[PDB]
Each structure stands twice: as structure tokens, then as C-alpha cells.
Design a protein around this ligand. Structure first.
Ligand SMILES: Cc1cc2nc3c(=O)[nH]c(=O)nc-3n(C[C@H](O)[C@H](O)[C@H](O)COP(=O)(O)OP(=O)(O)OC[C@H]3O[C@@H](n4cnc5c(N)ncnc54)[C@H](O)[C@@H]3O)c2cc1C
Ligand SMILES: [Mg+2]
Lengths: 662, 55
């Protein structure tokens, strides 16, 4: 039922690869497009389409992730950060936290490609999603794309508090932070959730599984890891593959698919440089170490790796407030209701991503003056020039994203912060011919001195905005930076009466404190009389820092940052000779053709020369449709019907038609 | 020769605030120095019986 020779191969099941695959199959119908993926098929998989069970996908024993491990680095205090990668069809779209956001207009301009300008990509960004939200800026958001975006069907009350708290810190509340022209802001964060159904909006169901029902000319080859891309006579005409799991040691197996006219790498920013390097694309010197024969000289493959630096800081919440923390804990009685409401209706806690509100930031020069002089020096060259770019982002999660086995029982609200444009640059490289062998690579977290100041400053900022929220009960001190014990900057725990409130009536140890493990939090200043009851506020004292209280936050960040999976770079656009933005030299042409070979293209999110200050999923879709359009013109097909609409039953706004709301 | 310098035992549980520790079952070691060298003091600050001494 599967033929050996596809017309257009599309390696990878990544969200970008599903874009290229779905769009490409659609343009001709007659054309035969075969997609190859190293992972399980995900059609109608309950653990994928329903949004609220996202954290499970990240477990270490979890099937759907690869968990690459980095070489140890001094900068992380000897820490060896894991760098997880998606391993299911649809890529990370089947796994992601479903945060929605969009990068600055300056970002796409920074690629400085012959194309790829924001002015050109705006319509293409507009073509790939419908916008369930009550849009005000309708000249930018699409309104009838395959992928749906909304606020979900449930809303934790945390968001209003986070907004009233952020607004008091001099951070403006902007209705749309995805406008592409903003630094400071706050918003009720959008999610990749189909509001009309409550399902996750991954690219696979929207592009691949929606096309296959409708059209015969698409082949899905799940569970076949790519080994190598055979190339001869200057054309990339084949791709030998191996099974994803080597279950038959005595007789290893492989298969060689053929592509008549085009080939495409959408394997993600980690796997892809490896696949090029196994084919011999790289430095001959670096490649002889693995014994692979160097076919083409591309030093830039594997270089210029880039991430974001998230780190979580939980704060305990009052007992009376709602959280998803007890669902993922997870109780057998709460969880039953949480599912039962979703099947019965479609609107429940399960039908929402955890994160509820968030704040992009660009520091005031007055507060910028106290940052380390190195970062000031970086700010002048990098951000001084451009107004559009945020330096750092943080949001708020209505629960604890982490291991609940290792934290005290209760309900928490956890702040999430990720640096927007880390200066640091990593690398990656294969060590062995074997597909299965783990690459050695240096993500290079905190490799550059300049990356620390914004991190510390955002912890100092987010703590203050979590201290002004109505929900706040006290920091969880075990998961906060290790301040000296007598410091006034210290992370205080929950009150005694709240300790009784969580402990239950029958506890024999609530306020009992021996060993001084934690310090009780002081009562809030009394509400003013003579104010309107709705305007009264009771508030904790502001905290202040010294050098010894800064070193602690610094060590905290060094010892607890990790990849945010916004990884990109490696194979990237630029001159073959080299450029300032890509010191080792680029490998792609502006038309996404790999240098030195004919017929090979990259659809990965790796393509980007430099960071996009937004969650990476949107650029995945966008780059996937760029490479799709490029393949389209490369085939010589007319600009008429060059647009490649997927089948879908469009639902209107509920007031336009009666069949579309929750 | 008779005098121990220090003692510790073992408690078949966690003697402390269970609200502030992750859920599970623990065995907690307990150690107390036998003869601390240090010497303290105590003194009343006020005539009132109820007043807390500084010490
Ligand atoms: C846990 C998690 C949470 C995230 N949350 C968010 C979020 O909330 N919002 C957001 O914007 N971004 C988020 N992302 C990041 C975002 O999903 C990724 O940037 C995006 O999916 C990148 O897509 P890609 O096409 O570049 O790579 P991928 O989606 O990883 O595509 C790569 C595919 O190729 C396959 N593959 C790899 N090697 C081979 C090989 N040798 N042969 C065959 N197949 C291979 C992989 O199995 C995978 O399916 C998150 C990511 C993680 C993983
Ligand atoms: Mg990834």
C-alpha cells in the first residue's frame, strides 16, 4: 500500500512539517507527497487533543519526548541541563503548553533575507489561523485559518489579579500584545485551543489528518527515524531510514525512499543539523571524528544554537482560591468531575491551558541604571537601536508546573519567566554514524556575561507583582533563592491560621516549628476605613536588596534555568562566506535551499538567524508556509491557486451562524 | 572516659510541620550535643510577672 518513490518527501512530523505536508498535498492533488515521521501517529488520541493534561507530556518516563542531555558547564554550576524534544506526529504542537504570542516586526526584518520581511510575511501569517477572540485589530489577525486560537472554555480568577497587580507597577494594559509593535504590556494571554470544541489546536489534525480523509495523494510513514540523506549527481534523491526502536539486534533493518523532484527537512532544530551532518554536511575536520565522509563544506551546520531561559518561582495561594494543582496532583474524585464536565459539555478546567495572563517588558532607564554595566553595554547596541523589542517576559500559571511529589501539599500560583533574546550561542554535533547515538552539544546557557542581569531583575519584578495579588499567601521557600537567613529580603511562608486551613481539623502539627525551617509571614496592613469597600486594599511591605541578596538570586538562576523549547539556529540563513549575525556562516540560501546541493530544502524552525521574541510555534507555522510557497514556485506552478487551502468546515461567529460557541 | 560527646537517635516519622514538607513517609534522625561548652543567661526586665524576660 506504500510505494517506494514519493513525488515530494517531507521528513519530520513537526508542526512546521505538518504545515508543509498539508499545504503541499493540496496544491496539485495529482502530485504525490509522502511524509515520513520518527514517532507514533496521533489521530484522535485523547492525551493529545484535550488541552488540560499538557504537563504529563513532560515526564521523564514519558514516551512523547527525547530528552537530550547537555555536556556539563561551569556557568550552570556544573549542571547538565536536559534539552527535551518532541517525539510524536505533529511535533511539539501535540505537546506544547498552548501559549499564543507573536514576535516583534523588527525580528523578521533582522533575518535580512532577500525575502522574509515582515511586510511580506504579514499576509502569510494572516492565512494560517482563525481568531476566536473578539479582535479589535482585524487588519492583522486572520479570521478563517485552519488553526484556531482563543481564551479557552475556562478561566481561573488569577488573571484579573495579575492584571490589577501589573498595572500598578507602571506596566500598561494593552488589549492586543500580538500587535507586533509593543514593548510594555499586559494581556489575558491567548491559547492554541479550539474554543468551539475545547480540543487542542495542533497542526497535525488541522493540516495532515484533515487532508488525508479528503485526499488520497498523501502518505504518512510514522515510526521511521531518518538515518541519512543520500545524494548523487548533485541532487538529493533519496533518504535511507531506520526503525525508531531497534527491537531486533541480530538483523538491523533499513529502507530507502526516493523523491522525484523535491526533499524537505522539517526535523526540528536539534535533529536536523544531525541529519545533515550524517549526510556529510559540515566541517571535514569535525566530521572525520565520526568517520563520515565530508561531501559539502558547511561549517555553519550545528552552530548558532539559541534558546530562551525560563525558570519557575512558585508562590503559595490562599485555600479558598481555585487551582489546577489538585487535578494534576492528582485526586481520583476531582479529576473525575473535571473529565465528566468536559464530556458532558466541553467547558471545564480540563478545557484550558494553565497559564492565564502575562507581561512583556522593556526596562525603564532609571531602573536600568542599577543593572550590571555589561548588560547596559549590551542594551545600548542591541535594544537601544530598536524600540519594538521586549527584553524579557513572564506570565502566571494557575497551578504548579513541576513535580508535585517533591513539593509541600497545598495550592500554588507559579510565576513563569523566559528571557526574550538571550545573547548566548550554543552548538550541536553528531559523535557517531549511528542514528541512535546521542549527540554531544553545548546549549551554552549563560555562556555570555550579559544574560544574567535581566534574569535577576525579572525575578525581583515578578516577586513584587506576586506580592500585590489578592491570592498571595506566601512564598514556598524551598523553591526560591537561598537568601541569608536573617535577610529582610527572605522568602516568607504561609500564615499560621492558613497552616491550620490546609492541615485540616485533625492535624497534630500545624504551626509547630522546630529547627526554624521556615519563617511565618506577617499580617497585611489593615484596610483603610472611609474608602469604598470595593476600593479597600491590604498590602504586604515592599522588600529591598543588597549585594549578598543579589548573589543568592544569581546562584538561583544559574542553578535552575532550563530550555524553554524555543530552540532554533543550527542550520540557518546567511551568506555561505559568513556574516555578522552568523559568525560561522549560514547554510541555507534566502530561498531556503541548502548550500552546495540541488533539490534539498529546510522547513525547520531552525532556519532563523536570530531570536524571535515570541513563543516559537507561530514562526513554525509561518516558516512552514514560507517553504511551502517556495516549493510551489520551485515547481513552476502558477501564482493562481498557489494558495493551498486545507479542507475545513468553517464555523462563523455565533451571531453569524448558530453553530459555533462555548 | 565515661562521657559521650554527642547523641543521636531515630524517629519513625517526621517531627515537624507536615504542612511545609512534601507528602510521603519519612524517618527523621535526631541529634543533640551532650555537653555544650557554651553558657547562657537570663534576667527579668520588669516588676510585672507577665513581662517577657530578655535572655
Ligand atoms: C513541552 C513543550 C512545551 C512547549 N510549549 C510551547 C508553547 O506553549 N508555545 C509555543 O509557541 N511553543 C511551545 N513549544 C515549542 C514549540 O512547540 C516548538 O518550537 C515547535 O513545535 C518547533 O517545531 P519544529 O517543526 O521546528 O520541530 P518539531 O515540532 O519538534 O518537529 C520535529 C519532528 O521531527 C521528528 N524527528 C526528529 N528527528 C527525526 C529523524 N531523524 N527522523 C525522522 N523524524 C525525526 C520529531 O519526532 C518531530 O516530530 C513547546 C515545546 C515543548 C516541546
Ligand atoms: Mg523543540
Amino acid at each position: 500500500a506504500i510505494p517506494e518513490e514519493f513525488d515530494i518527501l517531507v521528513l519530520g512530523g513537526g508542526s512546521s512539517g505538518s504545515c508543509i505536508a498539508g499545504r503541499l498535498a493540496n496544491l496539485d492533488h495529482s502530485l504525490k507527497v509522502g511524509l515520513i515521521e520518527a514517532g507514533e501517529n496521533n489521530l484522535n488520541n485523547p492525551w493529545v487533543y484535550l488541552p488540560g493534561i499538557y504537563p504529563r507530556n513532560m515526564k521523564l518516563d514519558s514516551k512523547t519526548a527525547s530528552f537530550y542531555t547537555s555536556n556539563p558547564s561551569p556557568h550552570l554550576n556544573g549542571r547538565r541541563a536536559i534539552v527535551p524534544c518532541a517525539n510524536v506526529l505533529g511535533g511539539g504542537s501535540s505537546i506544547n503548553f498552548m501559549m499564543y504570542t507573536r514576535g516583534s516586526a523588527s525580528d523578521y526584518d533582522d533575518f535580512q533575507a532577500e525575502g522574509w520581511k515582515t511586510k511580506d510575511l504579514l499576509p502569510l501569517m494572516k492565512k494560517t489561523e482563525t481568531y476566536q477572540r473578539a479582535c479589535n485589530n482585524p487588519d492583522i489577525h486572520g479570521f478563517e485559518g485552519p488553526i484556531k486560537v482563543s481564551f479557552g472554555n475556562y478561566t481561573y480568577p488569577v488573571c484579573q489579579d495579575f492584571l490589577r497587580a501589573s498595572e500598578s507597577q507602571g506596566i500598561p494594559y494593552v488589549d492586543d500584545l500580538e500587535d507586533l509593535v509593543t514593548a510594555h504590556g499586559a494581556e489575558h494571554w491567548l491559547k492554541w485551543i479550539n474554543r468551539d470544541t475545547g480540543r487542542r489546536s495542533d497542526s497535525a489534525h488541522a493540516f495532515v489528518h484533515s487532508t488525508m480523509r479528503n485526499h488520497d495523494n498523501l502518505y504518512l510513514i510514522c515510526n521511521t527515524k531518518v538515518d541519512k540523506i543520500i545524494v548523487e549527481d548533485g541532487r538529493a534523491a533519496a533518504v535511507r531510514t531506520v526503525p525508531s526502536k531497534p527491537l531486533n539486534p541480530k538483523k538491523p533493518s533499513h529502507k530507502i525512499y526516493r523523491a522525484r523532484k523535491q526533499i524537505v527537512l522539517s526535523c526540528g532544530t536539534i535533529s536536523s543539523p544531525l541529519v545533515l551532518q550524517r549526510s556529510g554536511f559540515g566541517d571535514p575536520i569535525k566530521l572525520r571524528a565520526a568517520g563520515v565522509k565530508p561531501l559539502v563544506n558547511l561549517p555553519g551546520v550545528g552552530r548558532n544554537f539559541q534558546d530562551h531561559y525560563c525558570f519557575f518561582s512558585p508562590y503559595r495561594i490562599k485555600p479558598q482560591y481555585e487551582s489546577f494543582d489538585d487535578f494534576v496532583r492528582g485526586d481520583a474524585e476531582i479529576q473525575k468531575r473535571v473529565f465528566d464536565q468536559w464530556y458532558a459539555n466541553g467547558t471545564g478546567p480540563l478545557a484550558t491551558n494553565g497559564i492565564e495572563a502575562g507581561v512583556k517588558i522593556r526596562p525603564t532607564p532609571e531602573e536600568l541604571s542599577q543593572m550590571d554595566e555589561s548588560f547596559q553595554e549590551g542594551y545600548r547596541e542591541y535594544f537601544e537601536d530598536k524600540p519594538d523589542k521586549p527584553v524579557m517576559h513572564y506570565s502566571i500559571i494557575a497551578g504548579f508546573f513541576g513535580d508535585h511529589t517533591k513539593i509541600p501539599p497545598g495550592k500554588y500560583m507559579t510565576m513563569f519567566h523566559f528571557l526574550e533574546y538571550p545573547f548566548s550561542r550554543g552548538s550541536i554535533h553528531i559523535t557517531s554514524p549511528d542514528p541512535y547515538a546521542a549527540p554531544d552539544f553545548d546549549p551554552g546557557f549563560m555562556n555570555d556575561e550579559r544574560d544574567m542581569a535581566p534574569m535577576v531583575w525579572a525575578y525581583k519584578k515578578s516577586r513584587e507583582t506576586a506580592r500585590r495579588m489578592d491570592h498571595f499567601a506566601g512564598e514556598v521557600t524551598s523553591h526560591h533563592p537561598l537568601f541569608p537567613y536573617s535577610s529582610e529580603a527572605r522568602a516568607l511562608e504561609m500564615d499560621l491560621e492558613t497552616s491550620n486551613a490546609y492541615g485540616g481539623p485533625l492535624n497534630l502539627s500545624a504551626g509547630l516549628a522546630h529547627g526554624s525551617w521556615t519563617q511565618p509571614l506577617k499580617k497585611p496592613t489593615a484596610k483603610n476605613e472611609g474608602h469604598v469597600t470595593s476600593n479597600q486594599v491590604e498590602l504586604h511591605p515592599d522588600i529591598e536588596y543588597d549585594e549578598e541578596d543579589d548573589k543568592a538570586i544569581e546562584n538561583y538562576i544559574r542553578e535552575h534555568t532550563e530550555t524553554t523549547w524555543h530552540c532554533l539556529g543550527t542550520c540557518s540563513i546567511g551568506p555561505r562566506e559568513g556574516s555578522k549575525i552568523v559568525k560561522w556562516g549560514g547554510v541555507l540560501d534566502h530561498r531556503s535551499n541548502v548550500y552546495g546541493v540541488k533539490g534539498l530544502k529546510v522547513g525547520d524552525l531552525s532556519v532563523c538567524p536570530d531570536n524571535v521574541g515570541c513563543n516559537t510555534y507561530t514562526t513554525a507555522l509561518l516558516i512552514g508556509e514560507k517553504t511551502a510557497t517556495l516549493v510551489g514556485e520551485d515547481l513552476g506552478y502558477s501564482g493562481e491557486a498557489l494558495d493551498m487551502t486545507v479542507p475545513q468546515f468553517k464555523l462563523g461567529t455565533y451571531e453569524k451562524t448558530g453553530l459555533a460557541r462555548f
